Amino acid sequence: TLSPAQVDEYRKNGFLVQEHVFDEEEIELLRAEAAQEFASGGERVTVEQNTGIVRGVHGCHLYSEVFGRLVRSPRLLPIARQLLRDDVYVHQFKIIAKRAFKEVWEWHQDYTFWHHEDGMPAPRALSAAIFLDEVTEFNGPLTFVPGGHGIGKYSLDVETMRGLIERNGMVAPKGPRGSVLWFDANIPHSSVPNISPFDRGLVLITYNSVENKTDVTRGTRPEWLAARDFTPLTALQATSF
Amino acid sequence: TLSPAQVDEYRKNGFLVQEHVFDEEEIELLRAEAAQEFASGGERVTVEQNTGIVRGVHGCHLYSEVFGRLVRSPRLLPIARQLLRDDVYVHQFKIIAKRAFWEWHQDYTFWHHEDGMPAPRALSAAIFLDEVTEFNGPLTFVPGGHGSGMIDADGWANTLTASLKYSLDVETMRGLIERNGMVAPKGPRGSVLWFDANIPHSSVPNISPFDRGLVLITYNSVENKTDVTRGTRPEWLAARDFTPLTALQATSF
Numbered sequence: 001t002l003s004p005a006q007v008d009e010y011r012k013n014g015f016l017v018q019e020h021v022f023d024e025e026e027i028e029l030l031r032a033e034a035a036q037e038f039a040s041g042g043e044r045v046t047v048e049q050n051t052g053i054v055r056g057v058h059g060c061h062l063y064s065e066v067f068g069r070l071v072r073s074p075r076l077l078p079i080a081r082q083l084l085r086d087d088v089y090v091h092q093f094k095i096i097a098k099r100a101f102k103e104v105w106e107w108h109q110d111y112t113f114w115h116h117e118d119g120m121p122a123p124r125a126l127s128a129a130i131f132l133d134e135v136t137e138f139n140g141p142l143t144f145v146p147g148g149h150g151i152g153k154y155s156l157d158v159e160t161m162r163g164l165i166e167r168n169g170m171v172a173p174k175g176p177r178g179s180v181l182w183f184d185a186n187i188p189h190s191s192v193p194n195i196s197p198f199d200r201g202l203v204l205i206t207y208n209s210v211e212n213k214t215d216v217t218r219g220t221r222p223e224w225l226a227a228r229d230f231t232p233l234t235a236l237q238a239t240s241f
Numbered sequence: 242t243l244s245p246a247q248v249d250e251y252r253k254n255g256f257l258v259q260e261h262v263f264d265e266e267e268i269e270l271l272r273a274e275a276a277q278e279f280a281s282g283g284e285r286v287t288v289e290q291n292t293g294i295v296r297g298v299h300g301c302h303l304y305s306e307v308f309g310r311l312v313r314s315p316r317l318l319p320i321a322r323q324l325l326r327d328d329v330y331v332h333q334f335k336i337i338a339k340r341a342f343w344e345w346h347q348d349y350t351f352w353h354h355e356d357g358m359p360a361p362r363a364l365s366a367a368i369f370l371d372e373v374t375e376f377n378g379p380l381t382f383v384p385g386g387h388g389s390g391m392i393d394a395d396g397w398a399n400t401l402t403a404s405l406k407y408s409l410d411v412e413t414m415r416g417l418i419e420r421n422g423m424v425a426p427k428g429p430r431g432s433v434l435w436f437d438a439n440i441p442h443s444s445v446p447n448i449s450p451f452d453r454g455l456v457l458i459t460y461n462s463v464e465n466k467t468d469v470t471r472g473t474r475p476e477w478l479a480a481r482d483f484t485p486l487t488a489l490q491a492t493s494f
């Protein structure tokens with residue numbers, strides 16, 4: 001679990017980075033497994049329009065043994081329970097390929113899209129972005145308005161951003177391969193394009209509160225984008241095998 | 242004049258920043274004159290291909306007295322001469338609007354094919370009308386990538402596409418960057434970024450909600466004058482008058 005000093009950097013800033021949570025052997029396992037999901041997700045892999053290039057794949061924690069364990073990991077599941085003062089469930093899971101010379105980019109709040117088109121009641125959620133590769137200034141890093149979480153499609157306009165940014169600034173947190181970037185479901189952020197010539201990968205996991213579940217009433221999206229099964233997640237039945 | 246350390250740095254990396262060359266009042270005059278040039282520039286204002294968004298205005302030094310003086314500034318002209326080892330003239334002038342919310346290229350490549358520049362004995366001076374940060378689309382360079390070795394010598398729709406023109410492929414850049422890195426020089430308002438005609442570079446979009454301005458002056462060596470028989474563009478993009486630039490006399494007016 002996070003120190004109280006880490007919990008309060010997260011409460012203050014709206015995001016937090018822990019470095020080298022995962023080692024190179026575990027990351028490489030995640031990279032190989034992401035390649036299998038790319039090669040055999042069907043409708044679950046997103047492709048570009050006028051190009052044949054793969055940008056992402058979703059839902060893998062429900063079709064892959066490895067990713068099912070990943071989301072129940074002691075380096076993830078506890079921190080998400082702690083931070084959300086609850087038991088939690090995965091709202092969505094994806095693997096993003098930030099391709100060299102990049103996609104859709106506008107400043108947003110995640111909560112907004114979930115609230116309307118899936119049915120989240122409150123911003124009682126977060127995301128853990130696992131860095132499969134080093135995040136630098138030049139490979140399109142997630143970029144935040146720190147403190148920002150406190151709202152002729154769901155993108156924040158320049159007039160509101162103008163004000164939000166004059167007060168708070170902007171940060172593009174960096175980090176080595178194997179870092180985790182935890183960020184609030186109501187922090188405003190944007191993806192810069194990758195002007196480096198090197199592809200970059202991410203695993204993005206959204207933990208939602210159980211008390212805070214979806215209302216199936218409103219939902220439009222298939223299970224691999226928005227989750228139907230709200231069973232609390234627990235650590236793997238504990239074993240010497 | 243640049244110190245000997247600054248010249249060597251320019252020659253090694255292909256670029257150099259000088260901070261606070263122009264004071265605040267100076268920048269405001271340039272800003273206000275730039276806004277005039279955008280409102281009156283007519284066919285000299287350039288617009289994005291699909292969207293009609295205003296990107297720049299060209300050749301303003303031939304039409305505005307402030308800008309005609311600017312290219313002769315004792316803050317610029319002597320450095321241009323120093324670095325090029327010659328009399329110089331203005332090959333092109335633009336004002337760029339990097340709007341709130343691209344391709345790796347070498348400037349010289351375009352100038353050689355379209356304007357008849359016989360060699361990369363030219364440079365540009367980028368005057369920061371606003372702070373350059375990591376978030377407002379700084380010009381980004383491969384240090385040392387302008388060296389004569391660095392890249393081995395050489396489609397219709399591509400050439401008609403502004404953002405694609407004479408752009409380096411990802412395979413060329415992959416090699417360049419592994420070995421050399423990328424660097425995005427930052428600076429305060431009023432800084433000047435000098436960069437080589439042959440240095441590979443790119444500009445990320447501006448994701449800040451603030452517009453950002455830049456005055457870009459390309460100086461060329463007189464001995465490296467453009468071959469006018471190979472020129473295809475109007476004077477306000479590629480100059481054909483090669484009068485050596487001379488210092489402003491210091492006077493009471």
Ligand SMILES: O=C(O)CCC(=O)C(=O)O
Nearest residue numbers: 096103104110127190191
């Ligand atoms: O795929 C991307 O580039 C951005 C992912 C993201 O920002 C999100 O959904 O939270």
Ligand SMILES: O=C(O)CCC(=O)C(=O)O
Nearest residue numbers: 337348365380443444457
């Ligand atoms: O800042 C820009 O829009 C690109 C400028 C540039 O690449 C140049 O003219 O040398």
Ligand code: PRO
Nearest residue numbers: 092108109110113114
């Ligand atoms: O699909 C999702 O859940 C994310 C939320 C913001 C936009 N797309």
Ligand code: PRO
Nearest residue numbers: 333347348351352478
């Ligand atoms: O128009 C020009 O002269 C510059 C040269 C490279 C791209 N645009």
Ligand SMILES: [Fe+3]
Nearest residue numbers: 108109110189
């Ligand atoms: Fe997002």
Ligand SMILES: [Fe+3]
Nearest residue numbers: 346347348442
């Ligand atoms: Fe250029």
